[PDB]
Symmetry: D2
Subunit: 115 residues, 4 copies
């Protein structure tokens, strides 16, 4: 599991469950190519998006579909999405945890990168 | 104005208005002595807490009364208050802005220290 | 000034100065069209990006060029940029402040929407 | 494990290791009584602070000794401590994860509360 996404709801103090996550990788033509996607579990985590073989060096974008999450809770939020754009594996393979803490008019994102 | 406090509401996307703020200074007996207090304005800011003369080097605590703010909005919060403890240090002229971004189960606090 | 961008540096406790900011508007072909851009001032703020006339309802993206900011300071960052995607909605008069608090491996973004 | 503390370093994108954590509980005389303490592990987590029997209803303060952590990394930070003050178990026993994301001039704290 070289890439994991974790999403927390800062209004309820709970994992954000069933949040759609789309990962893209920048292609040589500079466009965003679909790479992997999934939904967060009951723990607010999304495991198994990729493998060490497929997760090569590159620029990746993790799009967390926060607006659909808040709309299902009856909240009209500010953001469409939370986006996390980063270069991965440029100094060799690493394990990445991308976390997002959500509120209707704010989000925080952090990364924990381990070798 | 050497010390200003700013509070933002991440649920409503607005300044957090009428939030009580208490500032304390650590005494020689290691207890916290009341130093200044007020309520945030319509802009979520609290100005005029102290003066350059009174705001000497020392350890200060800013307590932002977040629970009463959320309860007034009908929202169940986690924290009793947001706390910011810091040492004021003279290293040329300084102005301190202590900011807090609030959500019911999370807060971020930052300081902007300028000359 | 219906749209303002503010950027803060959580490592130095200062406004993030000379940060490039690019604003885009979603077009009918679903691509992102350049809309406005600038660099943050000495106060970490970027004013005058647009006018009430031009800033119509639509989906906007604010890209804050955080990686170039950290690299100029000699700090190894995680993100390529901080991204803020939102819909501008007319529901009475509105002023949008898009803020970003930056650290090398994390950022918080919030919006203050006032009348 | 009804109470766990997790600390992350937002400058390095790593767990914050060997961070001292002190927990206090408000006594009937309104003073803060020592309750539990420990140091974060290699994963930035602190487990085993208390038991379901000992972690009764009350107001608790989690003091994370951030200044000593940054000073060991050669950084003179703004805050003395990160403090998290909350009422626990007032609607019956709950499991609490108290997380803190650290930077030299800012900290964010969130809680994940599960039944």
């Amino acid at each position: 599991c070289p890439l994991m996404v974790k999403v927390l709801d800062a209004v309820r103090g709970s994992p954000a469950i069933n949040v759609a996550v789309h990962v893209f990788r920048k292609a040589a033509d500079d466009t965003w190519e679909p790479f992997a996607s999934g939904k967060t579990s009951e723990s607010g985590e999304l495991h198994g998006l990729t493998t060490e073989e497929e997760f090569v060096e590159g620029i990746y974008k993790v799009e967390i579909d926060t607006k659909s999450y808040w709309k299902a809770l009856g909240i009209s939020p500010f953001h469409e999405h939370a986006e996390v754009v980063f270069t991965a594996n440029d100094s060799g393979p690493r394990r990445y945890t991308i976390a997002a803490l959500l509120s209707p008019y704010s989000y925080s994102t952090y990364a924990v990168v381990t070798n």
